């Protein structure tokens, strides 16, 4: 097969970055490690929110962090916890301006990371994968999508024989640059191994 | 499968002469892409022609090429695991290329010491019809001569 | 008698008793075939049903190959009562 990451393939035109800060040497290395440890720490105790993105911006001790979520149900009104020390526990190895925002991803059926994550949950629920794929695609296609494509590969339904389940409706042109194609991926942990879920969501451009 | 007939490459005319031929000769002299050393050697040898003979090198070089031109050459062709050698005519493009190539090669075959004197002498010998290149030309025509049997295979 | 090893795992298993070169469930299997290839005075003795013995072909001519399990082969050269170039190879 061999195909390039549809995110990296854009980056410049279509699909901007995810960590937008500028530094020269002697700083880039340290600030990138911290940046990645933020992404690592957030992903853990915020998965129940199902986060589509983790945007990060900086400006000398400013560190802004925008968490996109389908349902920000785990924020609960100011002093109702789930934010207070939670956005303050970041500065236990940072000590800088931990400005943590929360975004409301409107339609989760149009967010590739969320789609793949919903599918990967279902694999671990011991669902029928082929039927799960079909539904998720139509579900994405039901919410106004111009094209969709989900891919689960390896060890399907347990059973000693790595497979690859494939389904895709509408239009998904990966080669085109003016594409606006959202890509998501998820690890499904099973008692019989590990399988990967790709999810492609496409909308118009020009 | 040569869909395009590969158009003939055209060159830049030289200095002082305007030749549409001399530059092609300088190119064969050229090794490793040093046209400076190449052109110098030829013009050097042109100065050498003036000494041993009172002739303008533009004709001495011209006639030499004309004397080292293969009228017909031998071509290995078809049927029998490519067993035959049909003697074919030579295109003006190919006579051109062979003349200059054999000249330079025979020139560097000579026992002389300087590249210029080899070029100059081999040109003077070839202008007369004596050069080692003329040997090569006459040799290639012998082969083409001895194969007139199945020449009617032609093509 | 075995005289040479081309596989480091097998070599350690027979020499030092190091079983960390082979599959854990195939330690007893690999041991009893190696000992049988060692006590073998002629290739005819390595002819028990469970080994599925047979000389190889082509560029692997001169080589033999008893079966350990699955698609796994103990390939060697048997000459003058000795085996050489003992290799634990997948038949591919």
């Amino acid at each position: 097969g061999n195909k390039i990451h549809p995110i990296g393939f854009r980056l410049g035109i279509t699909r901007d970055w995810e960590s937008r800060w500028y530094a020269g040497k002697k700083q880039y290395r340290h600030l990138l490690l911290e940046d990645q440890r933020i992404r690592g720490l957030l992903e853990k105790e915020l998965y129940s929110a199902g986060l589509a993105r983790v945007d990060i911006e900086r400006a000398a001790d400013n560190v802004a962090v925008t968490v996109h979520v389908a349902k920000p149900g785990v924020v609960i009104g100011r002093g109702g916890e789930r934010i207070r020390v939670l956005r303050e526990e970041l500065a236990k190895l940072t000590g800088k301006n931990v400005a943590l925002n929360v975004q409301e991803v409107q339609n989760p059926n149009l967010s590739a990371p969320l789609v793949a994550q919903r599918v990967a949950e279902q694999i671990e629920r011991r669902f029928a994968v082929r039927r799960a794929i079909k539904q998720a695609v139509q579900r994405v296609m039901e919410s106004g999508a111009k094209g969709a494509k989900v891919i689960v590969s390896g060890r399907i339904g347990g059973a000693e024989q790595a497979r690859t389940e494939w389904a895709a409706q509408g239009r998904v042109p990966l080669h085109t640059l003016r594409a606006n194609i959202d890509y998501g991926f998820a690890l499904a942990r099973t008692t019989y191994g590990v399988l990967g879920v790709k999810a492609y969501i496409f909308l118009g451009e020009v | 499968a040569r869909r395009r007939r590969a158009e003939v490459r055209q060159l830049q005319p030289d200095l002082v002469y305007g030749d549409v031929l001399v530059t092609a000769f300088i190119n064969k002299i050229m090794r490793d892409g040093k046209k400076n050393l190449a052109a110098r050697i030829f013009y050097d040898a042109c100065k050498i022609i003036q000494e041993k003979t009172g002739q303008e090198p533009l004709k001495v070089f011209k006639q030499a090429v004309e004397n080292v031109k293969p009228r017909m050459e031998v071509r290995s062709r078809r049927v029998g695991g490519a067993n035959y050698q049909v003697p074919m005519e030579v295109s003006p493009r190919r006579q051109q290329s062979l003349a200059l190539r054999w000249l330079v090669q025979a020139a560097n075959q000579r026992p002389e010491r300087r590249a210029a004197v080899r070029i100059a002498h081999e040109l003077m010998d070839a202008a007369e019809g004596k050069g080692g290149a003329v040997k090569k030309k006459e040799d290639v025509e012998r082969m083409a001569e001895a194969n007139r049997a199945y020449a009617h295979y032609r093509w | 008698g075995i005289k040479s090893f081309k596989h480091k795992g097998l070599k350690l298993l027979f020499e030092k008793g190091v079983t960390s070169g082979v599959p854990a469930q195939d330690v007893d299997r690999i041991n009893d075939r190696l000992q049988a290839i060692d006590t073998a005075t002629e290739i005819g003795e390595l002819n028990r049903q469970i080994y599925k013995l047979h000389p190889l072909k082509g560029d692997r001519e001169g080589y033999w190959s008893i079966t350990v399990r699955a698609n796994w082969r103990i390939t060697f050269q048997f000459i003058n009562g000795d085996a050489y170039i003992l290799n634990y190879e997948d038949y591919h």
Binding site: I4, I7, G8, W17, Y22, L32 | - | -
Partner: protein, 60 residues
Amino acid sequence: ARKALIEKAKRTPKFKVRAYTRCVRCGRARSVYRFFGLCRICLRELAHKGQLPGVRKASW
């Protein structure tokens, strides 16, 4: 030897020449870029992710 080996890579005492680079995301000791502090493998992953500020595909 992998866990106790990514320990030494950060421990860095005893003679200055015994200290060496080491990918942080992984534990790779080879092809470790000083600029990112990452191996060539990890660096490619994150560059496609978009988590590498400014880092962009090279076409010319």
